[PDB]
Scaffold this active site. Structure first.
Site, PDB file in Angstrom:
ATOM      1  N   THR A  44       0.841  -1.205   0.000  1.00 52.43           N
ATOM      2  CA  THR A  44       0.000   0.000   0.000  1.00 52.43           C
ATOM      3  C   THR A  44       0.874   1.253   0.000  1.00 52.43           C
ATOM      4  O   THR A  44       0.664   2.178  -0.791  1.00 52.43           O
ATOM      5  CB  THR A  44      -0.931   0.060   1.237  1.00 52.43           C
ATOM      6  OG1 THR A  44      -1.590  -1.198   1.419  1.00 52.43           O
ATOM      7  CG2 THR A  44      -1.980   1.161   1.076  1.00 52.43           C
ATOM      8  N   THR A  45       1.864   1.260   0.888  1.00 54.51           N
ATOM      9  CA  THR A  45       2.742   2.410   1.083  1.00 54.51           C
ATOM     10  C   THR A  45       3.631   2.657  -0.138  1.00 54.51           C
ATOM     11  O   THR A  45       4.093   3.781  -0.353  1.00 54.51           O
ATOM     12  CB  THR A  45       3.578   2.244   2.372  1.00 54.51           C
ATOM     13  OG1 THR A  45       2.687   1.999   3.467  1.00 54.51           O
ATOM     14  CG2 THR A  45       4.409   3.490   2.679  1.00 54.51           C
ATOM     15  N   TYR A 107     -12.808  -3.562  -2.796  1.00 47.40           N
ATOM     16  CA  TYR A 107     -13.890  -3.058  -3.647  1.00 47.40           C
ATOM     17  C   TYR A 107     -14.988  -4.071  -3.992  1.00 47.40           C
ATOM     18  O   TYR A 107     -16.166  -3.780  -3.790  1.00 47.40           O
ATOM     19  CB  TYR A 107     -13.384  -2.341  -4.913  1.00 47.40           C
ATOM     20  CG  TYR A 107     -14.510  -1.633  -5.635  1.00 47.40           C
ATOM     21  CD1 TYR A 107     -14.948  -0.378  -5.213  1.00 47.40           C
ATOM     22  CD2 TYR A 107     -15.173  -2.236  -6.706  1.00 47.40           C
ATOM     23  CE1 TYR A 107     -15.998   0.273  -5.852  1.00 47.40           C
ATOM     24  CE2 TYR A 107     -16.233  -1.592  -7.350  1.00 47.40           C
ATOM     25  CZ  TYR A 107     -16.633  -0.337  -6.914  1.00 47.40           C
ATOM     26  OH  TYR A 107     -17.675   0.320  -7.532  1.00 47.40           O
ATOM     27  N   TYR A 133      -2.462 -10.344   3.847  1.00 49.95           N
ATOM     28  CA  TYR A 133      -2.583  -8.953   4.288  1.00 49.95           C
ATOM     29  C   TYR A 133      -4.061  -8.664   4.532  1.00 49.95           C
ATOM     30  O   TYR A 133      -4.825  -8.395   3.598  1.00 49.95           O
ATOM     31  CB  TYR A 133      -2.004  -8.004   3.230  1.00 49.95           C
ATOM     32  CG  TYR A 133      -1.894  -6.539   3.623  1.00 49.95           C
ATOM     33  CD1 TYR A 133      -2.306  -6.080   4.871  1.00 49.95           C
ATOM     34  CD2 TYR A 133      -1.398  -5.608   2.719  1.00 49.95           C
ATOM     35  CE1 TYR A 133      -2.206  -4.734   5.210  1.00 49.95           C
ATOM     36  CE2 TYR A 133      -1.298  -4.270   3.045  1.00 49.95           C
ATOM     37  CZ  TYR A 133      -1.702  -3.836   4.288  1.00 49.95           C
ATOM     38  OH  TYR A 133      -1.589  -2.497   4.604  1.00 49.95           O
ATOM     39  N   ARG A 138      -9.423  -0.877   4.605  1.00 48.57           N
ATOM     40  CA  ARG A 138      -9.279  -0.584   3.177  1.00 48.57           C
ATOM     41  C   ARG A 138     -10.108  -1.512   2.289  1.00 48.57           C
ATOM     42  O   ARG A 138     -10.707  -1.063   1.309  1.00 48.57           O
ATOM     43  CB  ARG A 138      -7.809  -0.639   2.748  1.00 48.57           C
ATOM     44  CG  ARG A 138      -6.934   0.442   3.359  1.00 48.57           C
ATOM     45  CD  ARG A 138      -5.547   0.452   2.734  1.00 48.57           C
ATOM     46  NE  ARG A 138      -4.648   1.362   3.441  1.00 48.57           N
ATOM     47  CZ  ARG A 138      -4.537   2.664   3.191  1.00 48.57           C
ATOM     48  NH1 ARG A 138      -5.260   3.234   2.234  1.00 48.57           N
ATOM     49  NH2 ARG A 138      -3.690   3.398   3.903  1.00 48.57           N
ATOM     50  N   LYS A 162      -0.092 -10.231   7.749  1.00 48.86           N
ATOM     51  CA  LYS A 162       0.098  -8.814   8.062  1.00 48.86           C
ATOM     52  C   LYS A 162      -1.269  -8.374   8.506  1.00 48.86           C
ATOM     53  O   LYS A 162      -2.177  -8.185   7.687  1.00 48.86           O
ATOM     54  CB  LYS A 162       0.592  -8.038   6.837  1.00 48.86           C
ATOM     55  CG  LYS A 162       0.734  -6.537   7.103  1.00 48.86           C
ATOM     56  CD  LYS A 162       1.170  -5.767   5.855  1.00 48.86           C
ATOM     57  CE  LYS A 162       1.296  -4.279   6.170  1.00 48.86           C
ATOM     58  NZ  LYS A 162       1.373  -3.540   4.910  1.00 48.86           N
ATOM     59  N   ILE A 204       5.151  -5.050   9.635  1.00 52.72           N
ATOM     60  CA  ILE A 204       5.360  -4.483   8.306  1.00 52.72           C
ATOM     61  C   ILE A 204       4.902  -3.035   8.406  1.00 52.72           C
ATOM     62  O   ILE A 204       3.722  -2.752   8.620  1.00 52.72           O
ATOM     63  CB  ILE A 204       4.675  -5.291   7.186  1.00 52.72           C
ATOM     64  CG1 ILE A 204       5.325  -6.677   7.079  1.00 52.72           C
ATOM     65  CG2 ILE A 204       4.788  -4.550   5.848  1.00 52.72           C
ATOM     66  CD1 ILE A 204       4.567  -7.679   6.225  1.00 52.72           C
TER      67      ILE A 204
END
Ligand SMILES: N[C@@H](CCCC[NH3+])C(=O)O
Ligand SMILES: N[C@@H](CCCC[NH3+])C(=O)O
Ligand SMILES: N[C@@H](CCCC[NH3+])C(=O)O
Ligand SMILES: N[C@@H](CCCC[NH3+])C(=O)O
Lengths: 294, 294, 294, 294
Positions: A44-45, A107, A133, A138, A162, A204
């Site tokens: 993501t980052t 989504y 993850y 999100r 994660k 993480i």
């Protein structure tokens, strides 16, 4: 390994928005030198959503090349489309990644059985270890401990999580459903402390981009069972954890790095290269508190 | 003074629904004998909502009497009406309570300034130390660290928080806004472990009603900095923490105690004296896992 | 009747916080004169939480006396304690109320079976019709359409719902589970329009305290099937609906009435007699837009 | 031009997972013949997330071809990456689309200013009218009425909203911020009724895939101001609206169409080509209730 302080690396861009390969390489080298225990390129980052598939693959490749097998490279291979996840996973494997970070589909909101099918398909397509993850803030959907446990039982290469639920009781539930040997890594910097107390073995990390040495020492203290020392690091780092996330973490992090190391603030739309004055002031104050700025 | 394992005591009833003073006294004696470090009479778990004012006051009195100054009595004095909170707080003070547990007003949803006014009025009315009980899952409103910090600055007798947000980063934020000497106690059994890692010094506990010795030893391990041992207790207790709360905690707890100690399952409507078979089975399994039943 | 515009009446206080009986009577008389179709004394908006049981009972009595059987009085009889709900319900019945408004228990978070038991106990204790007040934003728990349908089947005197879920599909689901003859009244002013389109027959209303004529005409338009006209009223009233609830509705309403009719702003803690400047400005603007102020 | 019943078209697949162009064309022909007032190819329901860019573009092309300008084609052009949204929007424009449906970025959680920048960039890149697709249940972020109003003021080609907030007061707020001429279309089938009562002029619909004639007649009733008739359609259609969404709507819809029209249930992972028996039973009952199956 899969333990300790593992930065979810930013992807630096030049002003025109193109991937800045030399800046990325320098960031990775510095991370390793400062004590980061592993690397996650294109999470993501790393702005995975706004990279093309070619760019995603290239940044993963570059991370592997620069790391030179010094620390594990846990390559971002997440997608809300199972086909795309497999495509990214296979590339990362071929390129020489040590593991894969695979996000819950976002989504499209699949069922638990859909989550099982998605992760099963990825697990069967590759030989590499996979870290799930799980990030309901999100992806909206939330992989249950039961679904996670089923995946662990079915696939030898589903090795960890994660965990970005922010619900520390989930670590305890995941210990029950997945076993004590299941690798649990915090997906939240601000609760990495409590996360390890519950059985986690690392984080993480977004903040590790800015303060890799302090974050590595923080994780080392918890590994040693020195939670009093770990709390001292939390006192030092919490203002930074908070300030970076007042607005999107990618943007907070790039601002912090612009101040400490002169990194470029450029991000790709819909993320913004700018922040509110109060956010910048809070990050400045946090950097000073941590001893990263005078 | 206010630390360790502090049961939010159940209020046992006889079959006519009246307070069972004999059973309550026996429960308190047993709690202290088994190692509980403090007592909260007439909290949520003590069915504060379904007691009359007279009954509320009587249970507080009885708890103080039975405790005989052996451990601190932190009396429930919460209400969504400031007048009632003051009335209950003044009685508890006159009766000899050592502190007060004061919940954020529920149902009427005051503003942050309303919260400030409420707690200020209570603090000014009494001389006793006050522990703020912040529980958004029940009260909906959420006292911010800023509001909490303002109360701490304004009133010397606002000394701590029973934090039931389940957001462990809040402990870190409250350390910043309220200071390191601010007494933070977990309001959630399942995350008491991570809570103390973040700087908490105990837990006002539902599970301690059922397993007072194990809960006290768990807290003792964390006080000693032995988080590895604390995790071993979490392994032993987590199934119980979860099982008690599958349905309302009061009812889970009274069922558990009916099996271990022959306690009456009677509660007051809208709580039920019955549970689903799956809940009872899970509690049974948890008790066996903890070594409390064969 | 139980239809149309039914104000959840404010309870006016003098500066010292005592119930202002003459102001309350005047408010009720004006409400009836302006076209309100029913009255709810001592609901949420009547500050039920901060009245004593004696005061609660008295305000209900006074409302019945002043109404003089001109419109139905649906008396607030809500509590999170079944005993208290029965006590309040029996008083209201004896005093001459036409129906009861009974909220889902707040704070203590009962199960669906607990909700069934609570409402069943109240229904069996009285002969009066009962309107279920389902408000998850305050009570957290949410009576399902299935539970509601079960109560309707079991008790002839459970006749309707004040539905404050804000989920208009619930009206459709409640039509299925409870029948087309089940009386559905909006618990939200801002969505009263869509609520009636889905099968609702009125609104128990906060805004009706401020604009009883416009609210009554709005409801009359929907009864006539003139939804185009109803939308014209929504255009006129929406800014007021919104402005009143920027801070607690009780306080927004009392401010609005202080401007239009010189009513006292006094409320009981933890509610505040003051508002933010921006809230007051928004209410002023909304009153002007509605034609209630120049 | 953009009003009434507008199906968010499914994308049928063959057993190898490829787009079924024959089935898609037949579906579009049938939709128009049955009374659908517009078409949305490659929305959420069209499985936009699991199509490649080439496939996305092809389905849009095919929809335009088959429609033959009979009804407006509002092409899906949404992405969480501004570059991709622009790419898809430009293709749709060149292909002959009448408008664009552009979702709020998902997963990456931009700020309100990021949302403004995203939609501004898309609006400046094309000449076509744009309908903002605001769906917090999938994207997490929520475009405020203020941000929406700012976009309307800044760009003449931002003309409407597919509002999937499920908060009908938002329609009223959007009337204020964006004007009465702003085209508001429901993004939720189950509340399309109340949505139009608040000022909506249609629905971009999942259920229309299954019941295009009933949905068109439902919308026609509301356009005529016949809300009593509209409610009769809601009585007929609500069980279907609910049943389709017990599991993902795409899968509910494809099951329904497999029963009525022999359509392939094939979807792309992480969506599943199967459903729970209880879901299939509920859809069966809903189809019978609507008169679509015997
Ligand atoms: N924007 C798309 C594609 C990204 C592809 C590279 N990571 C997504 O977020 O899924
Ligand atoms: N049922 C009321 C009164 C309880 C009074 C004794 N604690 C409440 O929950 O606030
Ligand atoms: N404050 C208590 C008692 C109110 C009694 C009169 N309505 C409650 O909200 O339940
Ligand atoms: N799976 C990616 C790419 C889809 C591209 C075609 N719509 C996403 O959902 O953003």
């Amino acid at each position: 390994m899969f333990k300790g302080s593992i930065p979810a690396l930013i992807t630096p861009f030049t002003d025109n928005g193109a991937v800045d390969e030399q800046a990325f390489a320098a960031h990775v080298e510095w991370q390793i030198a400062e004590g980061s225990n592993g690397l996650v390129p294109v999470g993501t980052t790393g702005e995975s959503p706004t990279l093309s598939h070619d760019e995603h693959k290239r940044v993963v490749e570059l991370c592997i090349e620069v790391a030179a097998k010094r620390v594990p490279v846990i390559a971002g291979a997440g997608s809300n489309n199972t086909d795309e996840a497999i495509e990214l996973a296979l590339h990362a494997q071929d390129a020489g990644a040590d593991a894969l970070l695979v996000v819950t589909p976002y989504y499209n909101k699949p069922t638990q059985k859909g989550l099982f099918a998605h992760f099963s398909a990825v697990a069967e397509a590759v030989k590499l270890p996979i870290v799930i993850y799980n990030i309901p803030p999100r992806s909206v959907v939330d992989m249950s401990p039961e679904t996670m446990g089923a995946l662990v039982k079915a696939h030898k290469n589903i090795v960890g999580v994660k965990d970005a639920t922010g619900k520390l009781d989930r670590v305890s539930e995941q210990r029950i459903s997945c076993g004590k040997d299941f690798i649990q890594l915090s997906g939240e910097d601000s609760t990495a402390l409590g996360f390890n107390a519950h059985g986690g073995v690392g984080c993480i990390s977004v903040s590790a981009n800015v303060a890799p040495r302090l974050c590595s020492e923080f994780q080392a203290a918890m590994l040693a069972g020195d939670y009093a020392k770990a709390l001292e690091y939390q006192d030092r780092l919490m203002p930074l954890h908070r300030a970076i996330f007042m607005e999107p973490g990618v943007c907070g992090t790039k601002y912090a790095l612009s101040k400490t190391r002169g990194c470029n603030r450029k991000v790709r739309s819909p993320l913004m290269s700018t922040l509110e004055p109060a956010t910048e002031a809070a990050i400045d104050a946090a950097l000073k508190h941590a001893g990263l700025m005078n």
